[PDB]
Amino acid sequence: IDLGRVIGELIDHRKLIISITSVFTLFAILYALLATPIYETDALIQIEQSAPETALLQSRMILGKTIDDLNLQIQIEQKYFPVIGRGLARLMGEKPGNIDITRLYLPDSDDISNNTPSIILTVKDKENYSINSDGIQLNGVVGTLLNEKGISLLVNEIDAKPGDQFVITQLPRLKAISDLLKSFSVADLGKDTGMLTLTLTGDNPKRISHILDSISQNYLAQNIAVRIIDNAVTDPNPVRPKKTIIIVIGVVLGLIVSVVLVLFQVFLRRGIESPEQLEEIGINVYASIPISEWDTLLAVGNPADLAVEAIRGLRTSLHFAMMEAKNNVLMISGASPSAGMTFISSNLAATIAITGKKVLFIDADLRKGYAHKMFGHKNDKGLSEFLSGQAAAEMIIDKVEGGGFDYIGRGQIPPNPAELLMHPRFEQLLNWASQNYDLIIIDTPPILAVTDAAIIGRYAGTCLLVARFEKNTVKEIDVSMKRFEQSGVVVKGCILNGVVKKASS
Amino acid sequence: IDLGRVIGELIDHRKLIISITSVFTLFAILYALLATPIYETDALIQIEQSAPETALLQSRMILGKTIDDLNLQIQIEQKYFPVIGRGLARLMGEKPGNIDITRLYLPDSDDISNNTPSIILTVKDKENYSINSDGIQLNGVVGTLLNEKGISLLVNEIDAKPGDQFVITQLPRLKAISDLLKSFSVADLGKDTGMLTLTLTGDNPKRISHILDSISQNYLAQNIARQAAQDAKSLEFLNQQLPKVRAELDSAEDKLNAYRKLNMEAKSVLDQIVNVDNQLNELTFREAEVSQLYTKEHPTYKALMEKRQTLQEEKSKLNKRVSSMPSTQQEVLRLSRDVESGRAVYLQLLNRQQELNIAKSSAIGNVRIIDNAVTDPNPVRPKKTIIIVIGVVLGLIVSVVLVLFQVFLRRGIESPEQLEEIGINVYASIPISEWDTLLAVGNPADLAVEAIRGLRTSLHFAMMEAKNNVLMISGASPSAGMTFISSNLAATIAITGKKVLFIDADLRKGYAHKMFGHKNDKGLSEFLSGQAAAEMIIDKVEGGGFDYIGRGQIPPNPAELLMHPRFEQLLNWASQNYDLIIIDTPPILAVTDAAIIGRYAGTCLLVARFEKNTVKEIDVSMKRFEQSGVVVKGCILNGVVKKASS
Ligand SMILES: Nc1ncnc2c1ncn2[C@@H]1O[C@H](COP(=O)(O)OP(=O)(O)O)[C@@H](O)[C@H]1O
Ligand SMILES: Nc1ncnc2c1ncn2[C@@H]1O[C@H](COP(=O)(O)OP(=O)(O)O)[C@@H](O)[C@H]1O
Ligand SMILES: [Mg+2]
Ligand SMILES: [Mg+2]
User: Measured between alpha carbons, how far is B639 from B9 in angstroms, rounded to an integer?
Assistant: First the structure.
């Protein structure tokens, strides 16, 4: 391979790459701007060793004493319904509220799994509030204690707007100790000094400072029954999330996934890409019709389109190729349906009729042909009604309105098309028409699907295949060529279709 | 190779890969949701070194003391019949029951292998229960002790629904110590500090906490005993008492020797009394030590006194039972009682002396318990997420390797390119027909009939300039499609207004007359043998349009019949009255009928099954036709299916 190919592929798939990278970067931005900030506080302790003290600091005794002092077993959570309500509330400048609780005791349901009882407190005003545990609504007031239904609760100094809601959970002492220990760290930083650095990470900038101060005071008072060089202070800059690295990771991940997806798509495409592939095998590509961005003939509605120019080029190629042929019958066929046989054949008939030569257009697609729909029709007495013998050769031929060439529609769909096409009346029709017209163009069904094309091809002076740009493959075209060879029909060449401009070319 | 091939193979075998991965993931889910949870408890000990203490913690002395304290030698298992009953019971929210047992003693069968006696206790209500050891059913009640058939049992506070069953095993002390030590671990975590982390893993969240607490308390009390031992008179008391007990033991031994120079019930009650005496002596020592180091109102002391009362009750019952026995055995029973009691007390006092020396020679001034044992509510095993990930990855791996094995073990044809490489013109490729009647008649618009019409158009040009109008369809292996292709082709050529004759020259297993509607008399055999004319053999297909000649009766010498010149006369006569003659033949790799017939055939075509036959078989068939003087025009693939790997 070469760099030109990969650059062309990247340029071609720029839209997909940009879209994927943009969506990944947007997700990264949302996460980095909605994640709850996590502040870090630290303290410095002088030890008058330091390994046993490091192990003893994180013992459940000291942390439990601190939790009992600060009532860390009463979890209060401001309630936002979604997973992003807190982030947007912080972004909108909304001030988070807080409630000071000094006494809580829930009935302690203590089922198999949920060992943590919880209630919901809704703020009604600055003074009173509502409590619901399992739908049981009660009214309480700040100040006076509440002792009802096995629930004891004391509220002091509630600071929030009315209508706010808070989840109040009485989690077990061990769970609170584990939570505190999970975010609390100790280091020596000298490996021999009396200096110990204590670190605590949490989302409340003042609560973590108070907690670490309490931990240090408890440790010092326990030992005195060691000096605090630096009382705990909180860094105002959050340590998580790190927005810049998150955005960089998002952008890089988007680029990587876009690149690998583009590589997968490139290595999984098999369709034709240029007439060079067909010319390698030994097939003369007679044209390359581009896609027409424009139920009427393109060669009539928009005679100056690019596709009609390509078809005029094909007409000039044919005027020399179709010399010294045994007769003046051209058969346009294909490999797979919806390739362009009818489009190419009809437009070519129009472009050859506009030059003053009489043209006949036969729609021998007795299975799904719709030429009469595209030309304006008297659908009676098609090709079928002639082949079966219930019509003459004169009532089948009609005139296109904006064309200039005659046509013979299929007519009624027969039950035995391929068995009809073998009738000698078909050859009689072609022989009669060849003496009254300058050109006869026969449209046929695919050859990979049915065998009508190979039956008709015996009486065709020239035969041309039509290959779709991206859909068909070189293998399909080669198989079609060989299947025409076996049946005794010599294919002149191919005609690419549906071409679009690709930067990788 | 290329990535396209492997992607195509994966897409083709998506069903197998998905099935295998799904079943493996289901098994992983079942294991991760049915495995018994294992909780972990831990404790933190301060050492006032730490390597000798690490070795001493896991010594049999401390663990044995803990087991004797907590009666860990009485294994109680809730009974579920299957290997998954416990998991589903836990999943269904069923509350597991428990029984508190303070005294158990089984008859101790003690055979060659099963040194662990066991019984089954079935819950009948909140109060009474049933006991079965080897089918012997007994009824007991919580509270009142049971002492029957050499079985002593005490039950307190049974909490389960009636109808539950429990296996009660009295496993040996050493086995219990090994089980406890297997799941118990100690670490230093500082390599120099006095901090030791003790870990214990078990399935009962409270029992493991109690066990680890007991271990820590025993270790601390053993270490601290030094301070309350140097001045303790227990040292001299033991130093004086031991010679007396040894002298008594020697006297009992001499008396037993003198009396010596085997009743099952007698020996059983002897062992019962020996056990009771051992428990009483050890309980007396434990009560003394607890009264020294604890208070009477402490629940442990009350447990000791109730156990002592129960032991006294059992001793009274055993004494009554002895009083019910003849004195001739009672004398030997008393002698054995004295000897065994002396031995047990001697060993117990030796242990007391050794433990006292252990305490006195203790160097650590005071070991402290920083953190009493607590249990993590989140189980440490099984780890569900990693189990599921491993299951999914294993399923993917086994599916991939199986697909690779199948891909590298296939040899059949896959595309007409393989046959065209060797130099064989593949004239068609008939797809499989998802639809005992001709396909070209029942469903004339099927894909296979379209492919056969393509073959007909190919033949109409191939069969030109041939020496006559006879076509011979043959094959390599049976059940390839010779009759299917030949009959359908005859139908599709007859529907175009050309007269067709169909000869079924498969004189061994031909069934054309079955598929066409038959007058089975006067087949091909009856003509070749000479017992029929050329006119009674030809019949008309009903929904066809072509004549046919069935095989008829199976002859004993088919290949020797086909060499008769009357066969050539028949073909020459038929060639002047029909537009086409199609002859079906048996395979050529199996028999030689095809090569005999092929001399008079203008055109010959082989039929190759898609996946079954191989390029080698087709080449061998071509060469075997060449040797016999028959020129094969080409091949016809059959049974084609759409494969993504193409
Ligand atoms: N170069 C082209 N530009 C725009 N539309 C095309 C082109 N070629 C074919 N088509 C359109 O795509 C459809 C399939 O082509 P058509 O020839 O009618 O079917 P078939 O190949 O099976 O006979 C048609 O509706 C046709 O108008
Ligand atoms: N393309 C096909 N689609 C569906 N069934 C087929 C096809 N080809 C053969 N068979 C069926 O499989 C069986 C074997 O084919 P057959 O020609 O009758 O045996 P043999 O090849 O030994 O003479 C037959 O029952 C036939 O109907
Ligand atoms: Mg068409
Ligand atoms: Mg057969």
Answer: 19
Helix axes A3-12, A243-267, angle to 10 degrees: 110
* Contact between B246 and B309 (Cβ < 8 Å): no
Q: Which neighbouring-strand residues pair with A240?
A: A38
* Nearest Cβ partner for A61 among B93, B371, B450: B371
The answer on whether A125 is annotated among ligand-binding residues is no
Task: Specify the 3-state DSSP secondary structure of A151.
Answer: strand
Atom of ligand 1 nearest to the CA of A294: 4
Give the Cα separation of A432 and A425 in Å (integer): 10
Hey, what amino acid is at B149? Answer: K
- β-sheet bridge partners, residue A442: A331, A362
What is the C-alpha to C-alpha distance for residues A152 and A117, in angstroms, rounded to an integer? Answer: 13
Method used to obtain the model:
cryo-EM
Count H helices, E strands: chain B?
Answer: 22, 20
Q: SS3 of B502, please?
A: strand
Which residue's CA is the closest to the ligand 1 atom numbered 14? A338
DSSP character at residue A413: P
Match 């101060």 to its residue by tokens. Answer: A213
Structure tokens at A23: 């969506």
d(CA A276, CA A279): 5
SS3 content of chain A, % helix, strand, coil (to 5): 40, 25, 35
Shortest Cα–Cα distance, B218 to chain A (Å):
21
Measured in residues, chain B has a length of 646
The answer to whether A210 and A69 are in contact (CB under 8 A) is: no
Burial class (CB in 10 A: 0-12, 13-18, 19+), B324: exposed
Q: Which among B44, B194, B496 is the nearest to A419, CB-wise?
A: B496
Dist CA A31 CA A84 (whole Å): 9
Query: What's the token pair of residue B224?
Result: 């601290």
Report the DSSP pairing between strands A38-46 and A195-202.
Answer: antiparallel
| B426 φψ region: left (φ > 0), alpha (ψ -120 to 50), beta (else) | beta
For residue A102, what are the contacts with CB-CB under 8 A and spacing of at least 6? A71, A154, A156
Residues near ligand 2 (Cβ within 6 A): B 430, 432-433, 448, 475, 478-484, 638-639
Quick one: which H or E segment has residue A77?
strand A74-78
Sheet bearing B151-159, strands edge to edge: B98-105, B151-159, B146-148
SS3 B338: helix
Strands of B27-176 (E only): list them: 38-46, 74-78, 98-105, 118-123, 128-132, 137-141, 146-148, 151-159, 165-170
Assess contact for B587 and B479: CB atoms under 8 A.
no
C-alpha triplet B43, B48, B52: angle, nearest 5°:
75
Concatenate the DSSP letters of all residues of B344-379 into one string.
HHHHHHHHHHHHHHHHHT---S--EEEEEEEEEEEE
Sorted by sequence, the CB contacts under 8 Å of residue A237 that are 6+ apart come out as none
Fill in the amino acid letter for B426.
Answer: V
Q: At what angle do helices B234-260 and B327-360 cross, to 10 degrees?
A: 150
Q: Name the β-bridge partners of B169.
A: B75, B118
Specify the pairing of strand A493-499 against strand A285-290: parallel
- What's the CA-to-centroid distance between A445 and ligand 3, angstroms? 6
Check whether the bond before B382 is cis (ω within 30° of 0): yes
Confirm if B609 and B638 have CB atoms less than 8 A apart. yes
Closest CA to B498 of B545, B568, B429: B545
Q: Which residue of B has its CA nearest to A449?
A: B450
**Residue in the block written with tokens 């409340």:** A204
Could you give the angle at which helices B264-293 and B327-360 cross, rounded to 10 degrees? 30
